[PDB]
């Protein structure tokens, strides 16, 4: 029987608005700047959520910092894919209720191909018929998806806590025959593994946009700037290890 389902339901963040003026003519600068402002305010809620995930605050605070710095992109992309599934049947990217990317905005963004990939992630939710309960378990697992090559300060406890949430995904799938449930577990964890390559490409584009912030007129708010500076160079340099299920 699932042990964390009611917890994950209760601690799930409410939706964040971008504050975008949709009457203005879109530019790549306005669209990327708005996504960064949305990211900043989502990050505040991701931190509060992670702190309420049982066991997370029992890691060394340095490990807590590291995991949030590594995992915010995956958590936020995955949540956006779910919103796109639930609100627009994955036909557009529902970054926020007031910031929905249609094809025109994907093109104007200067990251069209990455937007297409994020829409294909969203489409996987449709084809797999991902349930809310699966989604919440999968999203919690994304906090545990990347570690330093040299390990965490409390790596043993992290390993055990990660396995506890892997077992929870399995418990939820079974709660909702064993052969079909093992196949379901394979499908959902393969989906999470596939997200790792997309997240890496998004980290590359983030770095490039950050380096070019002034020339592009794309502003990064303070905590996004801090967290990108803290780990995106290390991610690009090969200093982190994705943890794959397969």
């Amino acid at each position: 029987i699932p042990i964390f389902l009611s917890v994950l339901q209760s601690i799930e963040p409410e939706v964040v608005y971008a504050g975008y003026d949709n009457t203005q003519p879109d530019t790549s600068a306005s669209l990327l700047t708005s996504l960064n402002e949305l990211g900043e305010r989502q990050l505040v809620r991701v931190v509060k959520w992670a702190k309420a995930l049982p066991g997370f605050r029992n890691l060394h605070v340095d490990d807590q910092m590291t995991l949030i710095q590594y995992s915010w992109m995956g958590v936020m992309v995955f949540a956006m894919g779910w919103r796109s599934y639930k609100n627009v049947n994955s036909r557009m990217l529902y970054f926020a209720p007031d910031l929905v990317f249609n094809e025109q905005r994907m093109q104007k963004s200067t990251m069209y191909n990455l937007c297409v990939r994020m829409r294909h992630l969203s489409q996987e939710f449709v084809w797999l018929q991902v349930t809310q309960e699966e989604f919440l378990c999968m999203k919690a697992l994304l906090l545990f998806s990347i570690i330093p090559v040299e390990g965490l300060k409390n790596q043993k406890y992290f390993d055990e806590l990660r396995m506890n949430y892997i077992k929870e995904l399995d418990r939820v799938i079974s709660f909702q025959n064993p052969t079909s449930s093992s196949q379901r577990f394979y499908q959902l964890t393969k989906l999470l593994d596939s997200l790792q390559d997309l997240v890496r490409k998004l980290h590359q584009f983030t770095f490039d946009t950050f380096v070019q912030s002034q020339s592009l007129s794309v502003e990064f708010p303070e905590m996004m700037s801090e967290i990108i500076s803290a780990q995106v160079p290390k991610i690009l340099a090969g200093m982190v290890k994705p943890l794959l299920f397969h």
């Binding site: 931190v47 702190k51 605070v61 910092m65 710095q69 303070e222 905590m223 801090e226 967290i227 803290a230």
Partner: peptide, 12 residues
Amino acid sequence: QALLRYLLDKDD
């Protein structure tokens, strides 16, 4: 000190 550290240390 970091903004992220503030958010991790604060109440809520």
